[PDB]
Amino acid sequence: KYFERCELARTLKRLGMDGYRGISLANWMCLAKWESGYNTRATNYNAGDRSTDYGIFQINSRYWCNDGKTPGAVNACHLSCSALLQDNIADAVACAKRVVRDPQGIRAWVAWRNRCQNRDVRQYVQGCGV
Numbered sequence: 329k330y331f332e333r334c335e336l337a338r339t340l341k342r343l344g345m346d347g348y349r350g351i352s353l354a355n356w357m358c359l360a361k362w363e364s365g366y367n368t369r370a371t372n373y374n375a376g377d378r379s380t381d382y383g384i385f386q387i388n389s390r391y392w393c394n395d396g397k398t399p400g401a402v403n404a405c406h407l408s409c410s411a412l413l414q415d416n417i418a419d420a421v422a423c424a425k426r427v428v429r430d431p432q433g434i435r436a437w438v439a440w441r442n443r444c445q446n447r448d449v450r451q452y453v454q455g456c457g458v
Contacts (some may be wrong), residue, residue: 329415331366331384333357334456341419341458343421349428356424357452358444366416378409383412385424385437390421 331339337357340346346353363386365447372381379390379398387405389395391427393412394403405423425437434440 329347329368331360331368333366333452336366337453337456337458343410343418344420345425346458349433351428351434351450353458354452355434355444356439358447359434359440361452362395362416362439362443363437367414368417368420369413371413380409380451382409383420384417385412385420385441387412387423387427388419392427420440 337353340356340360341353341416345351345356360366363381364384366384368384370381370383370386372386372447374380374388378392379388379401381388381394382393387409389398389409390401392403392405393407394401394408394453405426407419407423412423414420428434430436435445
């Protein structure tokens with residue numbers, strides 16, 4: 329499913345993402361926007377290392393979820409990567425939270441550094457009632 333901007337903002341807020349490990353909702357919005365365009369079905373195969381990025385936050389199979397086909401991969405979120413392809417994003421959010429509990433925090437996603445860090449991300453949550 330492709331979420332509408334404010335629909336996603338409130339969906340993430342209800343799932344407890346607002347200020348999680350000090351990360352604002354607008355930061356998460358910017359991340360989902362640049363990672364998948366708010367598409368829970370988004371997928372990207374990385375031919376270089378044989379891994380795949382899954383769902384709305386494009387979480388990688390090498391370390392976070394298990395798809396059974398990534399060489400020497402781990403499953404830190406303890407989830408089948410299929411769970412990251414559901415319209416319901418509760419599991420993807422649980423995993424995104426797991427990712428940010430590590431040292432890097434939101435910096436785990438290079439796209440956040442590229443397109444959200446030190447950027448004006450207000451626009452992502454304006455008018456959403458969050």
